Design a protein around this motif. Structure first.
Motif, PDB file in Angstrom:
ATOM      1  N   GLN B 366       0.894  -1.186   0.000  1.00 57.75           N
ATOM      2  CA  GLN B 366       0.000   0.000   0.000  1.00 57.75           C
ATOM      3  C   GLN B 366       0.928   1.231   0.000  1.00 57.75           C
ATOM      4  O   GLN B 366       1.710   1.420   0.936  1.00 57.75           O
ATOM      5  CB  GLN B 366      -0.844   0.032   1.285  1.00 57.75           C
ATOM      6  CG  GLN B 366      -1.549  -1.299   1.588  1.00 57.75           C
ATOM      7  CD  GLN B 366      -2.571  -1.670   0.535  1.00 57.75           C
ATOM      8  OE1 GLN B 366      -3.552  -0.953   0.320  1.00 57.75           O
ATOM      9  NE2 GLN B 366      -2.348  -2.821  -0.137  1.00 57.75           N
ATOM     10  N   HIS B 368       0.590   5.168  -0.098  1.00 58.55           N
ATOM     11  CA  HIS B 368      -0.462   6.194  -0.062  1.00 58.55           C
ATOM     12  C   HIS B 368      -0.082   7.440   0.714  1.00 58.55           C
ATOM     13  O   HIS B 368       0.769   7.403   1.606  1.00 58.55           O
ATOM     14  CB  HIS B 368      -1.772   5.585   0.526  1.00 58.55           C
ATOM     15  CG  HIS B 368      -1.645   5.017   1.913  1.00 58.55           C
ATOM     16  ND1 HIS B 368      -1.983   5.732   3.041  1.00 58.55           N
ATOM     17  CD2 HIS B 368      -1.298   3.773   2.343  1.00 58.55           C
ATOM     18  CE1 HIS B 368      -1.867   4.953   4.107  1.00 58.55           C
ATOM     19  NE2 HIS B 368      -1.451   3.760   3.716  1.00 58.55           N
ATOM     20  N   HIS B 369      -0.735   8.554   0.366  1.00 55.73           N
ATOM     21  CA  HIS B 369      -0.504   9.810   1.057  1.00 55.73           C
ATOM     22  C   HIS B 369       0.968  10.243   1.083  1.00 55.73           C
ATOM     23  O   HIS B 369       1.417  10.786   2.082  1.00 55.73           O
ATOM     24  CB  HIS B 369      -1.013   9.739   2.515  1.00 55.73           C
ATOM     25  CG  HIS B 369      -2.487   9.519   2.623  1.00 55.73           C
ATOM     26  ND1 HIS B 369      -3.029   8.277   2.885  1.00 55.73           N
ATOM     27  CD2 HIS B 369      -3.527  10.382   2.539  1.00 55.73           C
ATOM     28  CE1 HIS B 369      -4.345   8.384   2.959  1.00 55.73           C
ATOM     29  NE2 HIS B 369      -4.672   9.649   2.758  1.00 55.73           N
ATOM     30  N   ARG B 389      -1.451  -1.136  -4.273  1.00 56.21           N
ATOM     31  CA  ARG B 389      -2.389  -0.023  -4.333  1.00 56.21           C
ATOM     32  C   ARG B 389      -1.616   1.278  -4.152  1.00 56.21           C
ATOM     33  O   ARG B 389      -0.949   1.471  -3.122  1.00 56.21           O
ATOM     34  CB  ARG B 389      -3.454  -0.151  -3.257  1.00 56.21           C
ATOM     35  CG  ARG B 389      -4.423   1.043  -3.324  1.00 56.21           C
ATOM     36  CD  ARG B 389      -5.594   0.850  -2.419  1.00 56.21           C
ATOM     37  NE  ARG B 389      -6.498   2.000  -2.564  1.00 56.21           N
ATOM     38  CZ  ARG B 389      -7.535   2.207  -1.772  1.00 56.21           C
ATOM     39  NH1 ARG B 389      -7.782   1.345  -0.785  1.00 56.21           N
ATOM     40  NH2 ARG B 389      -8.314   3.278  -1.950  1.00 56.21           N
ATOM     41  N   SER B 391      -2.326   5.026  -3.833  1.00 62.43           N
ATOM     42  CA  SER B 391      -3.538   5.819  -3.595  1.00 62.43           C
ATOM     43  C   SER B 391      -3.280   7.142  -2.883  1.00 62.43           C
ATOM     44  O   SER B 391      -2.475   7.218  -1.957  1.00 62.43           O
ATOM     45  CB  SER B 391      -4.436   4.924  -2.716  1.00 62.43           C
ATOM     46  OG  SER B 391      -5.681   5.490  -2.289  1.00 62.43           O
ATOM     47  N   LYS B 392      -3.963   8.198  -3.336  1.00 64.55           N
ATOM     48  CA  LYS B 392      -3.906   9.493  -2.643  1.00 64.55           C
ATOM     49  C   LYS B 392      -2.517  10.069  -2.500  1.00 64.55           C
ATOM     50  O   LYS B 392      -2.224  10.712  -1.490  1.00 64.55           O
ATOM     51  CB  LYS B 392      -4.557   9.333  -1.255  1.00 64.55           C
ATOM     52  CG  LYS B 392      -5.964   8.722  -1.316  1.00 64.55           C
ATOM     53  CD  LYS B 392      -6.497   8.490   0.074  1.00 64.55           C
ATOM     54  CE  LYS B 392      -7.863   7.739   0.047  1.00 64.55           C
ATOM     55  NZ  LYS B 392      -8.285   7.560   1.457  1.00 64.55           N
ATOM     56  N   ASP B 613      -9.232  12.213   2.248  1.00 69.18           N
ATOM     57  CA  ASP B 613      -9.806  11.249   3.211  1.00 69.18           C
ATOM     58  C   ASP B 613     -11.268  11.537   3.546  1.00 69.18           C
ATOM     59  O   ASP B 613     -11.798  11.078   4.574  1.00 69.18           O
ATOM     60  CB  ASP B 613      -8.976  11.143   4.499  1.00 69.18           C
ATOM     61  CG  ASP B 613      -7.616  10.564   4.257  1.00 69.18           C
ATOM     62  OD1 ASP B 613      -7.439   9.896   3.230  1.00 69.18           O
ATOM     63  OD2 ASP B 613      -6.725  10.772   5.117  1.00 69.18           O
TER      64      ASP B 613
HETATM   65  O1  LIG Z   1      -4.510   2.882  -0.170  1.00 67.11           O
HETATM   66  C1  LIG Z   1      -5.239   2.925   1.037  1.00 67.11           C
HETATM   67  C2  LIG Z   1      -5.464   4.376   1.407  1.00 67.11           C
HETATM   68  O2  LIG Z   1      -6.208   4.944   0.360  1.00 67.11           O
HETATM   69  C3  LIG Z   1      -6.263   4.424   2.738  1.00 67.11           C
HETATM   70  O3  LIG Z   1      -6.534   5.809   3.102  1.00 67.11           O
HETATM   71  O4  LIG Z   1      -5.494   3.787   3.786  1.00 67.11           O
HETATM   72  C4  LIG Z   1      -5.281   2.385   3.462  1.00 67.11           C
HETATM   73  C5  LIG Z   1      -4.467   2.235   2.151  1.00 67.11           C
HETATM   74  O5  LIG Z   1      -4.336   0.863   1.814  1.00 67.11           O
END
Ligand SMILES: O[C@@H]1[C@@H](O)[C@H](O)OC[C@H]1O
Ligand SMILES: O[C@@H]1[C@@H](O)[C@@H](O)OC[C@H]1O
Ligand SMILES: O[C@@H]1[C@@H](O)[C@@H](O)OC[C@H]1O
Ligand SMILES: O[C@@H]1[C@@H](O)[C@@H](O)OC[C@H]1O
Ligand SMILES: O[C@@H]1[C@@H](O)[C@@H](O)OC[C@H]1O
Ligand SMILES: O[C@@H]1[C@@H](O)[C@@H](O)OC[C@H]1O
Ligand SMILES: O[C@@H]1[C@@H](O)[C@H](O)OC[C@H]1O
Ligand SMILES: O[C@@H]1[C@@H](O)[C@H](O)OC[C@H]1O
Ligand SMILES: O[C@@H]1[C@@H](O)[C@H](O)OC[C@H]1O
Ligand SMILES: O[C@@H]1[C@@H](O)[C@H](O)OC[C@H]1O
Ligand SMILES: O[C@@H]1[C@@H](O)[C@H](O)OC[C@H]1O
Ligand SMILES: O[C@@H]1[C@@H](O)[C@H](O)OC[C@H]1O
Ligand SMILES: O[C@@H]1[C@@H](O)[C@H](O)OC[C@H]1O
Ligand SMILES: O[C@@H]1[C@@H](O)[C@H](O)OC[C@H]1O
Ligand SMILES: O[C@@H]1[C@@H](O)[C@H](O)OC[C@H]1O
Ligand SMILES: O[C@@H]1[C@@H](O)[C@H](O)OC[C@H]1O
Ligand SMILES: O[C@@H]1[C@@H](O)[C@H](O)OC[C@H]1O
Ligand SMILES: O[C@@H]1[C@@H](O)[C@H](O)OC[C@H]1O
Ligand SMILES: O[C@@H]1[C@@H](O)[C@H](O)OC[C@H]1O
Ligand SMILES: O[C@@H]1[C@@H](O)[C@H](O)OC[C@H]1O
Lengths: 638, 638, 319
Positions: B366, B368-369, B389, B391-392, B613
């Motif tokens: 993961q 992210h951010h 993943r 993401s963000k 978020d």
């Molecule tokens: O990608 C995901 C992220 O978007 C979420 O906010 O926290 C969990 C991560 O796996």
């Protein structure tokens, strides 16, 4: 315990010599490790299902025919309820319950890599005094079938004679509804109730219904008439007889024939993949096959649990797909002294799984001293032929002799007689062809759109996977013989290759880079001390060879029934080319797999015995038989 | 036990708050599962080598800076023995023993996929008041170095500004003989003994010398100046800090900079492969890499033993290869809330391993951010991006933002801001791009000469391997923004693709066959509800989209230091497109891997929170932030 | 490539017969599969660390003594800086850097299933013309050691003769401080600077520092004086010579002696377990041993990767 089975027996008996059982399956339901089952003279119409396993090579469970007695296991039943319809066409009708859950007249030849998809064929069959029939598609085709004398061999696209032309007029057709199975056949004047007419009924003759039934020996039986299904590497692979995913069987001294598809199967079972390409249609069989290898590794596929079977001294013929077949389940096995012939000659169906012997992942498999003839393809090693050794075999009268496909080696083809006009299909790399007589062409091709696994040595552990770049082959001490109009006999196929791993490495590393730099250089070949007669052509960079395009050896393989002879003329110059004894020391390792040519125990392999098992000295005649010399040669080869 | 380390301590002490140790490595040599090591203010010039392992997430071994105290770990030493040579060039000399077995001035940047092979570079470095220098090849090059203000970005072949032009005039050169290491540098007028001048000395700052040292937390340190080696997937991959093939580390709240090559490594170790292509030269790195995957599976590579690391809340910059790197050792890890910048900008060496974050086999990782900017490539997922993943994240000021190579998915890229002009290199299949802002081109290409592994879901178990046929990608709810002269922005790349797996299957199965029939049909794409502005172009068969070629969003990312803002104009029609919330239910499975887009625990994945978020409504507008609206948008994104 | 090492060589040379290397470890740092390293007459005081692996039984890396030449690899150093203290006791002092990361005078015989816990022993040793000494516990025990002629065999609980009784009077004792190591020994009248006196220094003589260095052949050497640690099944098991968790070595025709604990090790490495009973004290060595078997199976312990070594025609003694 030594159990006895006899036609005077009873399954309610003790199973002793004086109070024997009646069926072989009753003995199979009670025999335990170390026991023997002796079967007395008779025809046993049943599918024998070994229930318990042997526990070691010492504590096997042995099934054998009584000494001097003729014992036959058949998957068919004799039918004496035929009624004449019209002309020479007769009909019989059976309750579907006669077949149970497996009805050969409903089940189709079906699955991955089956190519004849327009005219459906089924697993049933009809026999008149032992001779099988040809299935026809429509009721109308039963009445005036046409005698055919020639047929197209699908792979070579050559029209060839039909071995048994008279058989082409004997045809059958069947219909199965919710209640009954109705079978029609043209008996061409014979009365089928008076003659001995049989139909296929059961799928197998001797085959466990559970996996892991190890260490069984099956000896001395005649077995025939099994409705076996199409058996690609991506499906369950049942046969007329086979170990069904287990270890240590010995199948010996049997006469096996008339398996619809494959006779002896040392293949895989259903849980690791079952025709997913044909059923799901989302990915090709290629993709599902490489997945089945990993599915099996998770399902115990290893030397400890699967393989190490011995198939010896059997005669196997008149089968539609293979005399011996198998993906994964045959690792570490030995196949020797078998006589295999008449495989897939009727050509009722065709697909990419047909050959006298076809094995996928034949890891460290030893195939030697076999007589393979009258097959559309004698031997096909397809994927993962790592450590496989094809040695001292006699191939003749085949449309093609040997096909080694998408393999990386190290695989060895030594001291064989490959006498058919299309001798080798080579779609692999990592091979060593040593001391063979090759009298036909070789079709050598790269395979750049399919990558296939390679392994750690002497193991099912996966080391990697690769495409076939072509080359990285060794050819030493072979006698090549071409003929008028026949192209591609010899080793000229490799003319653009490098000649040593050192040269390859130097060329690739001339300019910095990775895969693209390797791809631009042709792999090395190791070729020396070969002879080329009657049109065969050599690799241009071979250093020591004998080339006499004008010399005709007049090779002939003379089959006299139980004996076979080789007739060959050799030039005076044959005395001047001498071959070295090859071994692990003399054979360069294969590049991608980075492995040596070794014995299955990891020790040095020395190729110092010829086709006739004669030990030869440091310098001897090239070719498969040390006794060959200039002039006339007439040698018994079987 | 809570051990304390302080500059007033002694390694002969008890290690208590009142009698603290002096070096962090002394604490690392005695701490056991459950213990904490608290380090007090100071600069610790040492390589910390955790000796004992944590035993669970509860019983970790925690190394942390004391609250409110500044703690620095450095791999360098300050040098105050410089002597002027001539002009502005000075020289120092050290005994080779100063470096022990690892001498950065002898060790080269070397190995698989390193492309700058002409002029050798070494792992040493010179710093003037914290600013690193440029290495020169010859002694003569030290005297009048030239200011450079622009440089060629190798991959894009675009000439771009050098971020710190003045730095280009500061150069160093070294020689190592059997006894001494002599280092020369041009200080451009400064006195290096008066100023604070340091040189690289040690390879790492915090890195075990044994593998399997699990469950270590490292928090709150500044770490810098590590002579880390080139780290391809086919070699040992040491870094400035890393777990060295183990499980469960937490690396958080650290400021890390000036790693020669990679800073944080969650990569592999040497026994599974170590630059065999570069050393043996017989097979390409491609072939040795796919072998290393199986070597590791045999060497415990599994969720039970490797990975599940957390890298969070760190600032990582000024590194030559990567801020975070790793093949295999990072499976199941989480990388979030990090600020990564200035990676590989000096361009002293180049090769195919450079990126802010590069991970091979990032299974279920993961990412992210994170704020990733001023890098030649922001993120590179290379091989086995299965379950990954992204993401963000916020990507800006990079030559290229994201590269996903030779992967089969299912991989997810959602709710990100990819603002660079070259946004995506896609040499994979099986991706899902959902709710992103993509302001640059995509280069999408098939890979037909390299096959790479895929796995069972949520596992390192190998399921198979495949080539990249292209397509089998999903694009939903993205805002694409082109630019004058910039081609290939959008989804028109997929114009020849099928639009559902059902269509693909029907087309392939029109003509019987196997692999060749599948190869002739393009894989499906699933594309809908995207917007295309300023020249971006859509997939012709997309059903519901918004295309305004003449609308210019005037996108700008405004970096104010600790805060970053997004400025964007959107058209009135912007909210006419209502995006769906995507999930395992709405995303079609990938074809070859035959897997769903799930959460790491195998349960449903629902993409119901946006870049900020915020919970997303069923009926949301598209793009990464639900609050975007027609007209002017000025939103804080960091 | 056939590399040569000789006392007339240089590690800056090409490593050929005419221009040989000087140290065996230099050849071990460059030899690759298929190469041979031929070492000429001499005493090589170094720990040889094969860097690259052989790739098959055919493509091994072979280290051998030159035909008819006496080649010795030792873990010790000769000491000629002894100063007399009193009576027959002498002392030498060495900066701790002389030992590096492994100092036999600091390291104890330690670990799972070691039973003599009261009096600690260390991995160091002192030799007088090849004869090793007995360690004593206190400085005072150096001066008037007593000749012993019988000893209790621990397992059988039988009193048996001491094979070399005279050796029981030769004792040593050492002290390691923050800067240096001081070794004392009773030479019973001999001058240790004039006689040939050696002390243990290095842990091993021929042993890779990475695992997986397969298919090495080591032939024809005398190897001696290694400060090897106690080697139970639940710990890393280094020896004077060994394959260090690999496959296919051939160790042959060597004379091996004076390893503190084990001479040839074909044992395990540290990652599958390292004295957890002795260090953690929560579970017995029995429990940790059965776990180490499963830890090794997960690490690829199998015929394909580990073992199949051949140890033949060697003479091994005084360990
Ligand atoms: O990608 C995901 C992220 O978007 C979420 O906010 O926290 C969990 C991560 O796996
Ligand atoms: O193809 C067959 C050929 O190989 C031989 O056996 O004669 C019969 C043919 O059908
Ligand atoms: O050589 C071949 C022969 O063996 C047989 O099969 O008929 C066809 C020929 O091409
Ligand atoms: O070098 C030889 C090698 O080929 C292997 O087979 O083992 C025997 C050795 O003598
Ligand atoms: O390529 C770099 C670019 O992305 C930005 O960071 O400005 C400096 C350039 O060297
Ligand atoms: O968009 C890119 C920008 O992010 C930076 O790297 O300079 C080059 C531009 O192409
Ligand atoms: O090796 C074989 C053995 O396993 C079997 O039991 O008897 C036949 C032998 O060839
Ligand atoms: O007439 C045909 C016959 O030649 C073939 O053998 O079987 C099919 C029949 O239709
Ligand atoms: O191969 C085994 C199969 O025969 C059985 O039915 O299911 C379990 C598998 O392991
Ligand atoms: O995958 C196998 C392929 O290599 C061959 O062509 O025949 C089909 C399959 O048995
Ligand atoms: O050639 C034969 C070999 O292939 C087999 O494996 O062992 C017996 C030999 O005669
Ligand atoms: O024709 C057949 C022949 O090829 C085989 O070898 O022996 C049996 C015969 O039926
Ligand atoms: O495993 C825990 C992780 O889930 C949390 O996010 O950070 C603390 C760790 O101990
Ligand atoms: O521009 C500088 C050049 O003059 C020197 O030779 O190499 C270092 C560069 O930064
Ligand atoms: O195998 C990897 C390849 O896919 C990529 O191009 O970069 C080189 C290697 O890291
Ligand atoms: O790019 C910025 C860099 O130039 C500065 O030094 O630190 C903050 C970063 O965001
Ligand atoms: O659990 C979920 C199930 O309810 C849905 O039908 O399919 C997706 C799964 O994630
Ligand atoms: O040296 C030989 C070795 O290579 C082989 O593996 O086993 C027998 C030995 O004699
Ligand atoms: O005197 C003792 C001696 O007998 C023994 O060998 O070493 C220990 C000494 O205390
Ligand atoms: O990964 C392990 C490696 O670190 C160790 O040195 O040797 C054993 C391997 O299993």
């Amino acid at each position: 315990m030594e159990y006895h089975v006899a036609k005077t027996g009873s399954d309610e008996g003790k199973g002793t010599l004086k109070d024997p059982f009646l069926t072989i399956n009753k003995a199979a339901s009670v025999a335990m490790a170390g026991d023997t089952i002796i079967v007395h003279e008779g025809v046993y119409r049943e599918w024998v299902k070994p229930k318990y396993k042997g526990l070691s090579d010492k504590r096997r469970i042995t099934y054998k025919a009584a000494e001097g007695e003729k014992v036959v296991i058949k998957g068919s039943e004799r039918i004496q309820s035929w009624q004449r319809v019209e002309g020479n066409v007769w009909r019989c009708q059976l309750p579907n319950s006669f077949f149970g859950e497996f009805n050969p007249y409903k089940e189709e030849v079906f699955g991955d890599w089956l190519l004849t998809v327009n005219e459906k064929k089924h697993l049933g069959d009809v026999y008149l005094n032992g001779m099988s029939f040809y299935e026809v598609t429509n009721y109308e085709d039963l009445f005036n079938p046409q005698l055919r004398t020639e047929v197209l061999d699908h792979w070579t696209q050559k029209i060839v004679p039909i071995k048994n032309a008279e058989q082409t007029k004997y045809v059958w057709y069947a219909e199965v509804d919710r209640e009954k199975t109705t079978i029609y056949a043209n008996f061409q004047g014979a009365d089928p109730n008076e003659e001995f007419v049989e139909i296929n009924v059961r799928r197998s003759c001797f085959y466990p219904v559970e996996t892991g039934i190890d260490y069984i020996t099956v000896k001395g039986f005649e077995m025939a008439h099994a409705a076996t299904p199409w058996a690609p590497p991506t499906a369950d692979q049942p046969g007329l007889i086979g170990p069904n995913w287990s270890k240590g069987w010995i199948i010996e001294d049997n006469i096996i024939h008339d398996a619809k598809c494959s006779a002896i199967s040392i293949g895989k079972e259903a849980t690791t993949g079952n025709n997913y390409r044909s059923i799901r249609k989302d990915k090709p069989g290629y993709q599902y096959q490489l997945e089945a290898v990993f599915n099996a590794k998770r399902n115990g596929w290893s030397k400890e649990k699967i393989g190490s079977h011995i198939i010896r001294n059997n005669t196997i013929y008149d089968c539609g797909q293979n005399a011996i077949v198998g993906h994964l389940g045959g690792v570490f096995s030995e196949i020797y002294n078998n006589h295999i012939y008449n495989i897939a000659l009727k050509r009722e169906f065709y697909g990419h799984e047909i050959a006298g012997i076809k094995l996928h992942a034949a890891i460290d498999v030893q195939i030697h001293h076999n007589r393979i003839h009258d097959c559309s393809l004698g031997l096909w090693l397809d994927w993962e032929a790592q450590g496989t050794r094809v040695s001292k075999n006699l191939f003749y009268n085949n449309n093609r002799d040997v096909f080694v496909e998408v393999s990386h080696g190290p695989y060895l083809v030594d001291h064989n007689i490959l006498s058919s006009e299309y001798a080798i299909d080579n779609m692999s790399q990592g091979g060593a062809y040593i001391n063979n007589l090759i009298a036909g062409k070789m079709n050598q091709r790269k395979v750049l759109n399919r990558s296939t696994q390679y392994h750690l040595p002497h193991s099912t552990e996966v080391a990697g996977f690769a495409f076939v770049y072509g080359g990285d082959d060794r050819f030493y001490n072979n006698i090549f013989i071409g003929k008028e109009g026949l192209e591609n006999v010899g080793t000229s196929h490799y003319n653009n290759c490098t000649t040593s791993l050192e040269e390859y490495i130097e060329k690739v590393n001339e300019v910095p880079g990775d895969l693209g730099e390797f791809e631009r250089v042709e792999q090395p070949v190791y070729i020396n001390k070969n002879a080329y007669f009657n049109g065969a052509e050599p690799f241009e960079k071979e250093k020591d060879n004998l080339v006499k395009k004008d010399f005709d050896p007049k090779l002939a393989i003379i089959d006299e029934g139980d004996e076979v002879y080789l007739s060959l003329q050799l030039p005076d110059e044959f005395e001047n080319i001498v071959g070295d004894i090859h071994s692990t020391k003399t054979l360069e390792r294969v590049r991608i797999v980075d492995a040596e040519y070794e014995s299955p125990d990891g020790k040095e392999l020395v190729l110092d015995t010829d086709y006739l098992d004669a030990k030869k000295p440091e310098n001897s005649s090239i070719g498969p038989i040390a006794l060959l010399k200039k002039g006339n040669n007439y040698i018994k080869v079987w």
